[PDB]
Design a protein around this ligand. Structure first.
Ligand SMILES: [Cl-]
Ligand SMILES: [Cl-]
Lengths: 805, 807
């Protein structure tokens, strides 16, 4: 086909062999503290703390993927020049070979042209607040070559995107650049250099960005973008590159830049390594950083090894070997890396997310925790502590958790100050409920029973044990019930576009509530809280009766009730008569029995499944959308309007695997697997190595096209569907149950899992070629009845053999 | 070729002719009005909008970059597959085989190009009163063989009229638009899926909105509504795939970035010319059909609409025309300063290539000052805007710092209200806003003689109502209710200078001189109104205020900038930085606080200290290492903006000052240093448009000394126009006549002025045989010698012949 790359499972890299990808395929470097997003054509931007308020490099979104981290190589013999990435020069691909390897927190750009080879390793060193472009030049010709390498970085005039892009009458007149031997220093508010140390004028001081070169002397420089590009020149042919010598002039007002040129004389077969460094540091620290890279080869290889060791070591705590190559690729590397990305970066910055953020969405962060629970349990513990501290003392979760979250002193949606500050006017019905699968899955993963009694403060006032925090969430749900005795809709639930009214009732939320009571029943059993346990039993019985009475329809559960009495999701409605999430969570929560779960899954597959996944609902909204059906503003088959919402794909997968339906769970995973779409990139457009937010549904002419890369809730739910669901990795408080749901073709597979200080080597065998089962279980050579391995049986190296047929 | 580097002024057509397209910056022109506006560069770049530049944007534009996208027209030769653009960019053909010329006129832009013996002429304009724009293309085959050409128009729509929704909230706006082909046009639907909503209903305060791009005068042969489909992967506007292949995809956009691409086939015989029309706007299909039908045979209708536009704007300009030996002065006063004043009066500071954000109202001092630039051209417009601004005055007499677009007199809030501060973002009153009414209103009444307007009752902003005379009384009372410690007006929030924070209890010399001049103007009004008690009040407090000014502000041959609320003296001759400010001396001369010899000292020192080749700096030395807490200008680079830059609005004042004292040589040289026309031969240094004014010029303390910034929409046009008309030319009317006291350069032997005044056309003939700056040797009105330099209104006939002898 027109394949653009393949997966290197040895190096854990996606290698792009053809550079004219259907979209900019990007990778992330560093962390939110210092982050760099880079495309396969070197485009992107860098920032500190905030993508839109701490932006170091200018980037024009929704355009040509420009500017970027450009490295030009010019042959002094024939004045020809090209770029280390295909763009911006865009040489013909019959004479210009190149490849772009995206790895964990690094990107390697190889290119061969005119018998000259270049390799640029872009990375942010582990724990560093700057970025490195390590260029290795190699002469492959039989003659000496004279080359001129030019690095280009386009600074912002202000860290704030609005000041740099909109307030031109101010930001065009505050910057200066200066050359300092081996670097260009850009000064924002340059004229404030004479202020007494610590003082400020109009809440502004001099800030400094830098662009330096180490490993070779600088032969010419330029700090003025226009002077570097030339009048009416694009990045494909900069004047300063064309002429073979930069202006050696700075910028004074206008648009600054970092442009450094360096001459190379390479013998036949000779290679040389240099580094470009970019960041937001003061002069002395920059001089130290540049001195560190004087001879770059060894230090750069050591930093690269440290990066790989860190990220691959986190990945190594769970590795699978199954007959499905796409499944292996996603579970072992790319889904896990994506889960770490969503856990660490939240929704801070991408090529779609480019504005300001006030804080962390509650349900988003809580759910993102689940993706990395089996990989970085201490990280998950700290994030769970944080999110529990973001719960108000009424049990509800703060819809927006401020970056300056200060437990014991925060305001809530019940305060006008919080609404004015965050922009979230009310509590949402579903937020706190997500705490139940998350917290449980953490405690089941680690056996950290003590955490149940750990005292954590509430957001506004008071403190409670984790157990009491969950009880307060349940109380919040019970303190806000609708007219059918089911949880009131409040502002909204998981679906931002489904406004049922504050007195409506969402079936999604009702099933979340039922599942929360199941989890809390487990907790109360451990705590010997008998009175609360019988309370939970009675409330769960009542809620199950209510759900079956008012939400069960024609082989399906309805979507919910509006506050005006309307029934959303009824089978006879002309539009949106079949919804995915109610059935997914009927199976997940256990509200549906065995036959009911099978029936709703059958109807889901028949009505909602497509080649690229399951649509959120069907038919799309258009001519019969009620007052709160906000999704109707979107094009059909797009976003919440009957799009294939990728996050929901996780839930249904898990649901299918909870019923032992290995064939359907794996089919859904494959339909949504980006690796499985590597041969259909042109339809998918989006990166084949990370998850997007949604795929355009069947009701769109662009069926199969994915949007919003990397930073979505999809990574976590699909990771859970793969690990907890398909692979049957189902721990509880006192051990781990193995109940896989796999495709029948799999004869056997292996799992290496770190679990409670022990390494589990698991061989699952399926000689009968079934979907699920439990014929034999052998733990350390001893047969164990059932499919459950108590923690008492675990040794430092535990061999497990599970025959499912 | 510095002599006429990139263009020249065509004073017969009243246009600027750009003969070389690689200009140092995008040189833009304005079409339409804020109702429907379109800003267009000499390479067709820019954007169009309805009502608001950033909340009603129709075409996407990437600012501070490559002047892209734009209103692009591609012509492709079907025989050899070669193509070019009607503007130089985006194709950018080599200029040795591609000739072109961009004529910017009053509310129209004409782009001529010749390539491969094919001539193209695109006339861009918004018809008078219309809410759409027209790109009329005329193609002429100058070769001796038949030519088959394919013309493609391209328009890049926004996905949402709000810039933040279209540029930032991509995860929302990338999934709400669709395009549809309808025979001769492409219709773009924002929130398209809302097409089947019940009558009048909306979803999330949203309904379908429609934009259109149509072609009339030739059949559409192919089309494309998807930007990515039109350009192609990794293609720029220089070579769209749809243009390269000679046929568009005929596919719409569905999500993503839509566009309007229309390709039409032409077969031109040798010497045959054909005219077609592209139309763009934000209207529904039913109206678009009629609009397109109107341009079926477009030559005559387009010529008629062009004639209407030219007649309108040139007829507003014709009310004042000068004939002086200075070509640059003629070009500025007759055409480009006047056109600029109309632009600033109508568009305020709504939108440009620098102003691309949201506006929530009008600045008080800005609007009131902008009124002055058109008083001698459109007096009824000035009256309407003065009425509005007086209705924008509050109870206490101070002006609202920002006048809302929904300004409702009698029901508005004030800076003393929390709702106003939350809504407009201005927390306190400014000390100078209302004072600007006094030079404005007077100059209107002096121009028209509309005495009844003094009686006209106009409501206040929050509550109550009063006559215009009582409005100025309330302004003086407001300035009298907020005095400082030296008996002068308190600083309040700020004065004209945005970067000089003297504190609410400080005292700015600028405001004190403004208050003195306001007192003089109100004294004239009280004399007309026989308010002798108020006249004694005015004389008394005026003598007092002058005493305090001269006691507390006079320094070493200069007036200080003011006092901070902590006691610091700003502008003291002994201060290491900013020891000499321009505006205090300018307004010492203007308000009459300084006497004759004192005005001479202050003007001498401002020349010696602040004058540069490109105008006078705001102050000197620049702030850097000796800035006080409120010297906010220190954040800007030296010689830039308010930090000792050549602020172009202040020039108009100093010119006027030098003209009020009769210093013709100094005033004319101060004009020449700032005249954009006079810098046409130094465009590479100026960068900015040589036919319109900017906000400031980089001062001597900057390595880019002489570069101007922020084009078109500034306060400079009005004040420099007043310095040229009321100042240099001496056109100084009062309540009952007109005085002619010109301050011209001694080199001028004789000049003429045609001015409409009080429903009468005055043909003024000034003679200066002694080569002097100013004077009054003889005055003849209609063949009868009149004493002095004054012409009472009863001497004015329908055709009034005036002959003045300066020497
Ligand atoms: Cl849903
Ligand atoms: Cl000033």
């Amino acid at each position: 086909h027109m394949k653009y790359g393949y997966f290197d499972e040895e190096k854990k890299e996606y290698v792009i062999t053809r550079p004219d990808t259907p979209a900019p395929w990007v990778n992330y470097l560093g962390s939110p503290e210092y982050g760099a997003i880079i495309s396969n054509n070197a485009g992107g931007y860098s920032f500190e703390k905030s993508g839109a308020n701490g932006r170091i490099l200018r980037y024009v979104f929704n355009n040509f993927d420009q500017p970027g981290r450009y490295i030009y190589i010019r042959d002094q013999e024939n004045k020809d020049f090209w770029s280390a990435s295909w763009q911006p020069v865009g040489k013909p691909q019959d004479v210009y070979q190149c490849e772009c390897r995206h790895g964990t927190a690094y990107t390697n750009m190889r290119a061969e042209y005119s018998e000259i080879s270049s390799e640029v390793l872009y990375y942010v060193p582990l724990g560093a607040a700057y970025e490195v472009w390590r260029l290795r030049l190699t002469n492959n010709s039989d003659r000496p070559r004279n080359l001129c390498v030019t690095g280009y970085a386009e600074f912002t005039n202000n860290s704030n995107y609005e000041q740099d892009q909109v307030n031109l009458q101010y930001s065009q007149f505050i910057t200066q650049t200066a050359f300092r031997g081996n670097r260009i220093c850009q000064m924002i508010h340059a004229n404030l250099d004479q202020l007494e140390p610590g003082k400020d004028v109009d809440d502004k001081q001099v800030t400094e960005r830098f662009f330096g070169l180490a490993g070779n002397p600088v032969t010419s420089w330029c700090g003025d973008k226009d002077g570097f590009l030339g009048r009416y020149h694009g990045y494909d042919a900069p004047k300063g590159v064309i002429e073979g010598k930069l202006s050696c002039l700075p910028n004074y007002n206008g648009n600054g830049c970092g442009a450094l040129s360096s001459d190379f004389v390479l013998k036949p077969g000779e290679a040389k390594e240099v580094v470009f460094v970019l960041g937001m540091k003061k002069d002395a620290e920059v001089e130290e950083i540049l001195k560190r890279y004087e001879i770059p080869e060894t230090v750069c290889r050591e930093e690269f090894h440290k990066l790989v060791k860190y990220w691959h070591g986190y990945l190594s705590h769970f590795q699978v070997k199954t007959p499905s190559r796409e499944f292996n690729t996603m579970v072992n590397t790319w889904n896990a890396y994506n889960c770490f990305m969503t856990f660490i970066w939240s929704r801070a910055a991408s090529f779609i997310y480019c504005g300001l953020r006030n804080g962390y969405g509650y349900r988003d962060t809580v759910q993102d925790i689940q993706g990395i629970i089996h990989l970085a349990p201490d990280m998950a513990l700290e994030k769970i502590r944080f999110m529990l501290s973001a719960q108000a003392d009424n049990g509800g979760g703060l819809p927006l958790v401020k970056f300056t979250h200060n437990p014991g002193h925060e305001d809530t949606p019940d305060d006008a100050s919080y609404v004015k500050e965050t922009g979230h006017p009310a509590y949402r019905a579903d937020d706190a409920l997500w705490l139940f699968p998350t917290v449980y899955k953490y405690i089941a993963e680690t056996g950290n029973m003590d955490f149940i009694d750990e005292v954590i403060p509430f957001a506004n006032r008071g403190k409670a044990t984790v157990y009491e925090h969950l009880k307060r969430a349940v109380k919040f749900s019970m303190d806000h019930l609708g007219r059918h005795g089911m949880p009131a809709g409040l502002y909204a639930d998981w679906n931002d576009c489904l406004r049922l009214g504050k007195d409506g009732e969402s079936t999604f939320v009702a099933m979340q509530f039922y599942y929360a009571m199941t989890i809390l029943k487990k907790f109360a059993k451990y705590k010997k809280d008998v009175e609360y346990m019988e309370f939970l039993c009675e409330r769960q019985k009542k809620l199950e009766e209510l759900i079956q009475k008012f939400c069960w329809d024609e082989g399906r559960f309805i979507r919910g009730f509006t506050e005006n009495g309307e029934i959303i999701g009824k089978s006879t409605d002309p539009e949106a008569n079949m919804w995915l999430n109610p059935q997914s969570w009927a199976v997940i929560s256990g509200v549906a029995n065995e036959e009911q779960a099978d029936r709703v899954l059958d109807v889901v597959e028949k009505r909602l499944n497509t080649e690229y996944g399951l649509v959120l609902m069907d038919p799309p909204y258009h001519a019969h959308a009620f007052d709160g059906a906000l999704a109707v503003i979107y094009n059909p088959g797009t976003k919440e309007n009957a799009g294939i919402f990728s996050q929901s794909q996780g839930w249904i997968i898990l649901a299918e695997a909870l019923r032992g339906h290995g064939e359907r769970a794996f089919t859904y995973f494959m339909e949504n697997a980006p690796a499985a779409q590597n041969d259909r990139a042109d339809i998918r457009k989006l990166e084949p190595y990370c998850y997007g937010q949604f795929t355009e549904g069947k009701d769109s002419p662009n069926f199969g096209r994915s949007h919003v890369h990397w930073l979505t809730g999809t990574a976590s739910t699909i990771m859970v569907g793969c690990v907890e669901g398909i692979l049957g990795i189902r721990p509880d408080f006192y051990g781990i149950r193995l109940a896989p749901a796999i495709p029948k073709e799999w004869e056997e597979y292996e799992v290496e899992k770190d679990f409670r200080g022990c390494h589990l080597h698991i061989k699952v065998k399926n000689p009968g070629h079934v979907e699920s089962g439990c014929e034999k279980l052998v733990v350390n050579g001893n047969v164990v009845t059932g499919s459950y391995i108590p923690a008492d049986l675990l040794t430092e190296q535990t061999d497990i053999e599970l025959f499912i047929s």
